[PDB]
Structure formats: structure tokens, C-alpha cells
């Protein structure tokens, strides 16, 4: 079996060498841009407010209007009306700002969640705005959290954790788990970030073939590929809790995708494996490409321990073995077009990240190139 090795990457030096030197402009220098059933009343009020109140305020009447408007949602409400109502309620929510009083803002948001349960887009906006609130608290207190706001940011993360499952959209759920986990992981809430990632991984096996997009049913294969790529890129920063095996969330996602029901005429699973090669190769470096403010990612947590690096290498070898097995089955299936496509992708992956100095990987790369050229 062909093993894998990681080409050493010095991201600091590579960016420093390849960065283009920009010359700042002084004044004078040229730059191009230099000079109940009566929901109609509720809609009328909300339109006037959203169109003619352009500064945030520091509600009850507007809240009652929104409650009356939202209570009209039933089984007989069409999707267009639900979209319009969600837009109006989100316009109301946007302008309610309590400034530096963060706790009252979160109280307003929890009340809004308890008031606008049916309309999903309002719930999505509420999750997004609570995430913005937690990140704003981090920005105001400059990363160095106080004992008082630690509980508040944990409360915001818990609000996201309890509210996201109530959504119906499968891909909205996955992306919001991922983003809320990142938001939690930017505030030293490691345990809840791990729970967010585990929830996303557990929810992955449910995405169907056909998804609703603007009223039309379209395949969910490409969207799942995009989400999995986003998740793999996110897992680079995530610390590994010591009570489990190394690369625990990475390995859990790999198991999930291995057991996922992919289409028979589909080869995107091998594409995602090719992508996993990228994440593992990056994760095997001395210092990671990107970091969170004060979360010890695996680069400093394990410190590049030989055991952790070896485990990463062995996982790389297993994924490559799976990919090569699929490539051979492609040859036995005689549909050489997909074989050549995946061979091009795999050779490109090896060239991108693999340590070509090693003879064993180099021979595999040469064989893949020749296999790709053997069938046009």
C-alpha cells in the first residue's frame, strides 16, 4: 500500500515571499473613486416603521402588531405570505438595539423566540443575531473575558444550541450548527462547541437526494459536498478533548460519510475523500494556517507529537486506500471517463499537499498521471 507524507509548509514565509507589496496613497494621489384577520393594518404599520425609522431604538406596540400578524400563520398560509411576514418581522427585530446592555438584548431575543415560533426565517435571524451579540461582547471586552460576561456568552451559545434544532431546513440546520460552533469556539466554550459539531455530524446522515430550492426539487449532492468541505476546513482549529481518540470529530465525520447513502452513479464521495487529504495534510504541519484567538488547536495542544502525527499519517493512508479501491473498481466498471476525472483530481491533490520527495508517494503520483493519460 502506498503511504502518505505531508509536505512541510511554512505559511508565514510563503505568504511573506509571495505577498505583493502595495504602496499606500497620500492625499493627492489618484484613486478611481475620488469625487386578527386584519393583517393589513399590521403590514401598513410595519412597512412605515421599516421604511422611516433608520436608527435603532431602545417596541411593545410593534411587538403586539407582530404577534397579531404572526398568529395568522396556519396550515392554509402560503409560502409567499410566510416569506413576506418573516421579512417584516425581521425588519422589526433589526432596529431593536439596547447598545451596551447586552443582557436585555438577549432577553429581547429569547422573548422573540418565544413569540415568533412558527415562522422559521425569524428564528434563523434570531440565531444569527444572538451569534452577533456574543461576538460583539467578545469584541467589546477584547477577548479577555470577565467572569460576568463568560456566563452571558455561554447563555448566547446555549440559546443557539436549543433554537437551531427547531428549524426545518436541513442545510440551514447544518450550516448553523457549524457557524454557532465556531462562534462558541471563539469564546473559550470548548465543551459546547464540541456538542455543536457532534450535532452537525449526527444530522449529516439525514440529508436526502432532492431538496427544495425556490420551489424546485434539485439534487443535494453538490450542496452536501460544499457543507462537508466547510466542516473539514472548520475542524482544523477545533481542539481535541483528551477523553477521546485523536482527530475524533474528523474520524466521526469520515465514518458518517463512509456509511452515508451515496448515489450509485455518483463519485462525489471519492472527491470528498480527496478533500479530506487536504485537511489532514494541513493538520499535520508545525503551526496551523489559521487560529482562534485563545483556543489551543491541535498544533499547540499536541505540539506535533510523533504519536499524533503518526495517527494522522495512518488515517491518511486509510483514506488513500479507500480512494485507490474505488479507482480500481472504476477500471473494472470500464467507465473510464470518471476514472480519468478522479485520477486527475487525486494527482492534483498529491501535487498540492503530498511530499513528492518521498519515493513511495511519487511512484503513486506518476502512476496516477499515466493512468489519467491512458484514457484521455
Amino acid at each position: 500500500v502506498f503511504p502518505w507524507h505531508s509536505r512541510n509548509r511554512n505559511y508565514k514565509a510563503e505568504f511573506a515571499s509571495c505577498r505583493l507589496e502595495a504602496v499606500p496613497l497620500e492625499f493627492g494621489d489618484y484613486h478611481p473613486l475620488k469625487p386578527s384577520v386584519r393583517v393589513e393594518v399590521c403590514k401598513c404599520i410595519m412597512d412605515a416603521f421599516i421604511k422611516h425609522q433608520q436608527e435603532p431604538t431602545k417596541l411593545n406596540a410593534l411587538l403586539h402588531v407582530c404577534k397579531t400578524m404572526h398568529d395568522s400563520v396556519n396550515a392554509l398560509t402560503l409560502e409567499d405570505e410566510k416569506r413576506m411576514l418573516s421579512y417584516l418581522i425581521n425588519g422589526f427585530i433589526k432596529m431593536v438595539s439596547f447598545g451596551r446592555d447586552f443582557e436585555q438584548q438577549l432577553s429581547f431575543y429569547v422573548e422573540s423566540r418565544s413569540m415568533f415560533c412558527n415562522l422559521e426565517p425569524v428564528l434563523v435571524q434570531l440565531i444569527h443575531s444572538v451569534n452577533r451579540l456574543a461576538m460583539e461582547t467578545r469584541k467589546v471586552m477584547k477577548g479577555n473575558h470577565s467572569r460576568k460576561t463568560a456566563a452571558f456568552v455561554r447563555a448566547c451559545v446555549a440559546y443557539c444550541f436549543i433554537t437551531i434544532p427547531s428549524l426545518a431546513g436541513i442545510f440551514t440546520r447544518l450550516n448553523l450548527y457549524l457557524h454557532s460552533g465556531q462562534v462558541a469556539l471563539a469564546n473559550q466554550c470548548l465543551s459546547q462547541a464540541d456538542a455543536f459539531f457532534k450535532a452537525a455530524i449526527s444530522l449529516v446522515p439525514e440529508v436526502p437526494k432532492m431538496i427544495n430550492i425556490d420551489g424546485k426539487m434539485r439534487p443535494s449532492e453538490s450542496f452536501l459536498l460544499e457543507f462537508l468541505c466547510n466542516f473539514f476546513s472548520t475542524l482544523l482549529i477545533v481542539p481535541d478533548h483528551p477523553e477521546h481518540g485523536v482527530l475524533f470529530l474528523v474520524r466521526e465525520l469520515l465514518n458518517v460519510i463512509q456509511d452515508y447513502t451515496w448515489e450509485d452513479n455518483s463519485d462525489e464521495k471519492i472527491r470528498i475523500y480527496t478533500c479530506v487529504l487536504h485537511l489532514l495534510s494541513a493538520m499535520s504541519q508545525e503551526t496551523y494556517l489559521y487560529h482562534i484567538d485563545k483556543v489551543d488547536s491541535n498544533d499547540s495542544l499536541y505540539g506535533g507529537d510523533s504519536k499524533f502525527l503518526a495517527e494522522n499519517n495512518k488515517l491518511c493512508e486509510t483514506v488513500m486506500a479507500q480512494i485507490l479501491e474505488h479507482l480500481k473498481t472504476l477500471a473494472k466498471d470500464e467507465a473510464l471517463k470518471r476514472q480519468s476525472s478522479l485520477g486527475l483530481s487525486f494527482f492534483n491533490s498529491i501535487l498540492a499537499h503530498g511530499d513528492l520527495r518521498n519515493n513511495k508517494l511519487n511512484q503513486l503520483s506518476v502512476n496516477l498521471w499515466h493512468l489519467a493519460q491512458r484514457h484521455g
Binding site: 502595495a22 496613497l25 494541513a282 498540492a352
Partner: protein
């Protein structure tokens, strides 16, 4: 012959930001822009309509949070002598890796690659190819950064030379920088 392209992205209106910075709207006046390449994450039709009022040709790719799921995942647009590749960048593993983007520049057979999931601005030439990460115009937060500086790129393309004017709002002042790129 000057061709003006507005490289923009990560507005996140209204998920993370209510609107663009005050001064950027004043600077971005209609009529002076020919193409608008957006890395995505406008997240609403309002930002798309705002862009439609700034130029005629408006190319937008799909973000990780865009509402319109019909926007292409990746795109190649030829302006002047330059083929430009547009992708959000959240597909890239890891985000903003040089080799992982050189792969896309090989696949597209493209001269400029624009990708901006990491909200930090970047502009680098690797293997005689140009990569621009315009950052977030609205300064939307990401877990990867602490002090996000609102920024957007404006490329003036003429024959073979691209001069990139990078606008970043620091404090309350809009600094602009010049980057010279020439296709061999």
C-alpha cells in the same frame, strides 16, 4: 481602455451587519463601475439590488449563507484580456491555502482567482497568477479574526496591466492602496 471591476464580498446583511460602512456608500457612486464580482454572502436580495444600481454586469457566487441557492458555486468571467475566477472560498480546505487555490486556478484555466471566506484582505502572486481576497465590505465577524477591517477591491484593467485599489476603513478614515499586476 480602462475596465473597472468591483471585487466585493461577505456583506452578511443582515445576518452580521446592518449595512455597509457609511463612507463606503458615499464612495461607491453609480455609473463609475462596469463589472461587479461578489465573492458571495450578500445573504439577501437587497444587497444584490444595491449592486445592480452600481454597475451593469453583476456576477455573484454562492456563499455559505446566501439565501438564493441558484447562484453558481464558481464562475469564470473574461474582462479585458483577463479571465477571472470567482468562488466564495468555504469549499477550500483549509480556507485560504495557497496550493488549495492554485488547484482551482489550474482547473478553471484562469488568470485571477477571487476567493474571500477568510475576511482578512490578501493579494499575492504565486506561479505568475494573481489571487485577491477582498475581505468583508461590512466588516462582518468571523471566528478566525479579532479586528476585522472593512475592505473592498477595485481593479482597473487595461490590456495587460491590472492596478488594484484596495479600500480599507481604519478608525473612521478610508485608506487606499495600489497593487500592480502584469500578465507575462
Amino acid at each position: 481602455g480602462h475596465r473597472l471591476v468591483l471585487v466585493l464580498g461577505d456583506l452578511h446583511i443582515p445576518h452580521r451587519c446592518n449595512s455597509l460602512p457609511a463612507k463606503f456608500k458615499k464612495l461607491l457612486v453609480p455609473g463609475k463601475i462596469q463589472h461587479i464580482l461578489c465573492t458571495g454572502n450578500l445573504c439577501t436580495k437587497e444587497s444584490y439590488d444595491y449592486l445592480k444600481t452600481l454597475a451593469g454586469d453583476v456576477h455573484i457566487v454562492r456563499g455559505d449563507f446566501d439565501e438564493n441557492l441558484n447562484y453558481p458555486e464558481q464562475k469564470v468571467v473574461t474582462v479585458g484580456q483577463f479571465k477571472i475566477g470567482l468562488i466564495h472560498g468555504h469549499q477550500v480546505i483549509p480556507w485560504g491555502d495557497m496550493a488549495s487555490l492554485a488547484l482551482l486556478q489550474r482547473q478553471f484555466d484562469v488568470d485571477i482567482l477571487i476567493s474571500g471566506h477568510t475576511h482578512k484582505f490578501e493579494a499575492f502572486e504565486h506561479e505568475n497568477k494573481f489571487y485577491i481576497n477582498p475581505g468583508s465590505a461590512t466588516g462582518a465577524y468571523n471566528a478566525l479574526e479579532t479586528n476585522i477591517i472593512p475592505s473592498f477591491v477595485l481593479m482597473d484593467i487595461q490590456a495587460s496591466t491590472v492596478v488594484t485599489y484596495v479600500y480599507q476603513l481604519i478608525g473612521d478614515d478610508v485608506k487606499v492602496e495600489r497593487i500592480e499586476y502584469k500578465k507575462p
